[PDB]
Design an enzyme around this catalytic site. Sequence first.
Site, PDB file in Angstrom:
ATOM      1  N   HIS A  28      12.253  -1.386  -0.936  1.00 30.76           N
ATOM      2  CA  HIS A  28      11.587  -2.132  -1.976  1.00 30.76           C
ATOM      3  C   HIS A  28      12.023  -1.774  -3.413  1.00 30.76           C
ATOM      4  O   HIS A  28      12.537  -0.679  -3.612  1.00 30.76           O
ATOM      5  CB  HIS A  28      10.088  -1.720  -2.012  1.00 30.76           C
ATOM      6  CG  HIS A  28       9.440  -1.563  -0.653  1.00 30.76           C
ATOM      7  ND1 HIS A  28       8.773  -0.560  -0.067  1.00 30.76           N
ATOM      8  CD2 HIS A  28       9.607  -2.587   0.309  1.00 30.76           C
ATOM      9  CE1 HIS A  28       8.462  -1.003   1.219  1.00 30.76           C
ATOM     10  NE2 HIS A  28       9.009  -2.180   1.416  1.00 30.76           N
ATOM     11  N   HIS A  44      10.715  -0.876  -6.806  1.00 31.75           N
ATOM     12  CA  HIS A  44       9.528  -0.344  -7.391  1.00 31.75           C
ATOM     13  C   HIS A  44       9.510  -0.780  -8.842  1.00 31.75           C
ATOM     14  O   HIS A  44      10.543  -1.202  -9.366  1.00 31.75           O
ATOM     15  CB  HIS A  44       9.444   1.127  -7.188  1.00 31.75           C
ATOM     16  CG  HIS A  44       8.948   1.416  -5.810  1.00 31.75           C
ATOM     17  ND1 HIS A  44       7.784   2.134  -5.660  1.00 31.75           N
ATOM     18  CD2 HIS A  44       9.378   1.090  -4.594  1.00 31.75           C
ATOM     19  CE1 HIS A  44       7.531   2.272  -4.373  1.00 31.75           C
ATOM     20  NE2 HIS A  44       8.497   1.687  -3.716  1.00 31.75           N
ATOM     21  N   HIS A  93       5.278  -0.965  -6.000  1.00 26.80           N
ATOM     22  CA  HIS A  93       6.191  -2.048  -5.753  1.00 26.80           C
ATOM     23  C   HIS A  93       6.171  -2.977  -6.940  1.00 26.80           C
ATOM     24  O   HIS A  93       5.100  -3.119  -7.524  1.00 26.80           O
ATOM     25  CB  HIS A  93       5.765  -2.864  -4.504  1.00 26.80           C
ATOM     26  CG  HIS A  93       6.033  -2.026  -3.287  1.00 26.80           C
ATOM     27  ND1 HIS A  93       5.633  -2.318  -2.008  1.00 26.80           N
ATOM     28  CD2 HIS A  93       6.661  -0.836  -3.192  1.00 26.80           C
ATOM     29  CE1 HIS A  93       6.009  -1.386  -1.179  1.00 26.80           C
ATOM     30  NE2 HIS A  93       6.664  -0.462  -1.871  1.00 26.80           N
ATOM     31  N   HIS A 105       0.903  -6.720  -0.551  1.00 26.15           N
ATOM     32  CA  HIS A 105       2.193  -6.389   0.039  1.00 26.15           C
ATOM     33  C   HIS A 105       2.522  -7.287   1.217  1.00 26.15           C
ATOM     34  O   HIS A 105       1.638  -7.526   2.089  1.00 26.15           O
ATOM     35  CB  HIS A 105       2.072  -4.932   0.481  1.00 26.15           C
ATOM     36  CG  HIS A 105       3.291  -4.505   1.223  1.00 26.15           C
ATOM     37  ND1 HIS A 105       4.472  -4.159   0.610  1.00 26.15           N
ATOM     38  CD2 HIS A 105       3.503  -4.393   2.543  1.00 26.15           C
ATOM     39  CE1 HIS A 105       5.398  -3.880   1.487  1.00 26.15           C
ATOM     40  NE2 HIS A 105       4.815  -4.019   2.684  1.00 26.15           N
ATOM     41  N   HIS A 117       4.887  -8.900  -2.691  1.00 28.00           N
ATOM     42  CA  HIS A 117       5.170  -8.374  -4.033  1.00 28.00           C
ATOM     43  C   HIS A 117       6.556  -8.891  -4.343  1.00 28.00           C
ATOM     44  O   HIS A 117       7.354  -9.186  -3.448  1.00 28.00           O
ATOM     45  CB  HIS A 117       5.135  -6.880  -3.813  1.00 28.00           C
ATOM     46  CG  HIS A 117       3.815  -6.247  -3.560  1.00 28.00           C
ATOM     47  ND1 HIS A 117       3.635  -5.098  -2.805  1.00 28.00           N
ATOM     48  CD2 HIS A 117       2.599  -6.620  -4.036  1.00 28.00           C
ATOM     49  CE1 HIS A 117       2.337  -4.790  -2.873  1.00 28.00           C
ATOM     50  NE2 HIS A 117       1.677  -5.689  -3.589  1.00 28.00           N
ATOM     51  N   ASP A 171       9.090  -6.743  -2.473  1.00 23.02           N
ATOM     52  CA  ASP A 171       9.044  -6.547  -1.011  1.00 23.02           C
ATOM     53  C   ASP A 171      10.249  -7.121  -0.351  1.00 23.02           C
ATOM     54  O   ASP A 171      10.316  -8.318  -0.112  1.00 23.02           O
ATOM     55  CB  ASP A 171       7.765  -7.165  -0.440  1.00 23.02           C
ATOM     56  CG  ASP A 171       6.569  -6.391  -0.916  1.00 23.02           C
ATOM     57  OD1 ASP A 171       6.476  -5.199  -1.316  1.00 23.02           O
ATOM     58  OD2 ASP A 171       5.541  -7.091  -0.870  1.00 23.02           O
ATOM     59  N   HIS A 193      12.516   3.773   2.212  1.00 23.36           N
ATOM     60  CA  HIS A 193      11.536   4.746   2.674  1.00 23.36           C
ATOM     61  C   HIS A 193      11.759   5.424   4.031  1.00 23.36           C
ATOM     62  O   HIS A 193      12.679   5.104   4.764  1.00 23.36           O
ATOM     63  CB  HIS A 193      10.227   4.049   2.803  1.00 23.36           C
ATOM     64  CG  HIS A 193       9.740   3.615   1.464  1.00 23.36           C
ATOM     65  ND1 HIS A 193       8.740   4.324   0.854  1.00 23.36           N
ATOM     66  CD2 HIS A 193      10.064   2.538   0.722  1.00 23.36           C
ATOM     67  CE1 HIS A 193       8.430   3.684  -0.275  1.00 23.36           C
ATOM     68  NE2 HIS A 193       9.230   2.628  -0.373  1.00 23.36           N
ATOM     69  N   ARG A 231       9.464   8.346  -0.108  1.00 27.90           N
ATOM     70  CA  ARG A 231      10.678   7.730  -0.670  1.00 27.90           C
ATOM     71  C   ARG A 231      11.809   8.684  -0.417  1.00 27.90           C
ATOM     72  O   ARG A 231      11.751   9.792  -0.960  1.00 27.90           O
ATOM     73  CB  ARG A 231      10.333   7.608  -2.155  1.00 27.90           C
ATOM     74  CG  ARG A 231       9.043   6.796  -2.348  1.00 27.90           C
ATOM     75  CD  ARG A 231       8.666   6.696  -3.805  1.00 27.90           C
ATOM     76  NE  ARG A 231       7.412   5.994  -3.916  1.00 27.90           N
ATOM     77  CZ  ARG A 231       6.793   5.534  -4.983  1.00 27.90           C
ATOM     78  NH1 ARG A 231       7.353   5.675  -6.185  1.00 27.90           N
ATOM     79  NH2 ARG A 231       5.610   4.903  -4.900  1.00 27.90           N
TER      80      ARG A 231
HETATM   81 CU   LIG Z   1       8.527   0.949  -1.399  1.00 27.26          CU
HETATM   82 ZN   LIG Z   2       5.022  -4.326  -1.609  1.00 27.97          ZN
END
Ligand SMILES: [Cu+2]
Ligand SMILES: [Zn+2]
Lengths: 151, 151
Positions: free
Chosen positions: A44, A46, A61, A69, A78, A81, A118, A141
């Site tokens: 994702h 951020h 995110h 999400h 998001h 995403d 992640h 992360r």
């Molecule tokens: Cu993430």
């Molecule tokens: Zn998200």
Amino acid sequence: ATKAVCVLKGDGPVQGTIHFEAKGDTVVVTGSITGLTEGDHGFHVHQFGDNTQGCTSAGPHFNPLSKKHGGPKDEERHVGDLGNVTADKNGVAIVDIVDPLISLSGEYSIIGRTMVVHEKPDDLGRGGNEESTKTGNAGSRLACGVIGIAK
Amino acid sequence: ATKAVCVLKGDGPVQGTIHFEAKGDTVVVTGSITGLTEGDHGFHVHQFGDNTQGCTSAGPHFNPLSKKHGGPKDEERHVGDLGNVTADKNGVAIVDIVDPLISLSGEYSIIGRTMVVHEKPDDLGRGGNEESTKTGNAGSRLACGVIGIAK
Ligand SMILES: [Cu+2]
Ligand SMILES: [Zn+2]
Ligand SMILES: [Ca+2]
Ligand SMILES: [Ca+2]
Ligand SMILES: [Cu+2]
Ligand SMILES: [Zn+2]
């Protein structure tokens, strides 16, 4: 800008280079990430391109439209995403996503923000726990980088 | 964005954190860099936020108006010419610059580009050879980072 690049680095072994290219109204994300435990990993954008506290200062995110999400094909997601990347047995994840929501310019611009890979797979907001609707339970992360303008 | 940040890292001991804040119609650059040899070091915004080949892939000075290299107070200067930062006897340089050409949005935006600290003093385009008009003879890139959006 029409091309962007991200160099993912972390405290461990995860490393990778992601390329972004604006193609009409989509952004094509390509690249590979290595050192990943085989399987799916949350991928994702951020909100902040702040690496002063490693990947933690990247914030949540990127979610300019304050949605829940979701996964990339969902409408309620998001902007950051991008779902999951999958590491093969060797820990190599080859990225190839085409997204219509992230952008290299304008309001949804992700230039200057952080790409995060992640620890666990993103449950895509279908995990039936509140966490799932916030981060998709992707956990820690592993590696991240600021997205910069590329030639 | 009204705030940006950059973590400088290189292959050596040089490292630092630079913060950028839009205050009024100007941009205030603050921060500190450590690990430097005593004296002046060129400090510039390079065009690309591409760290795939270390600081080398950052490209030349950000120069949207196509001018020659100069010092920050010159009219003929690149947008990314922030002059020199000065390290004390312990290798510490305190950054405090207010600049009228860089910005955190629009055509002169530096978000997504790279901040570089160089090995030698920037001669402010007055050294008399062609290289002075391009890079100020500031030499190699000691440390660099992609400028991202901060909270
Ligand atoms: Cu993430
Ligand atoms: Zn998200
Ligand atoms: Ca975890
Ligand atoms: Ca040099
Ligand atoms: Cu330079
Ligand atoms: Zn210059």
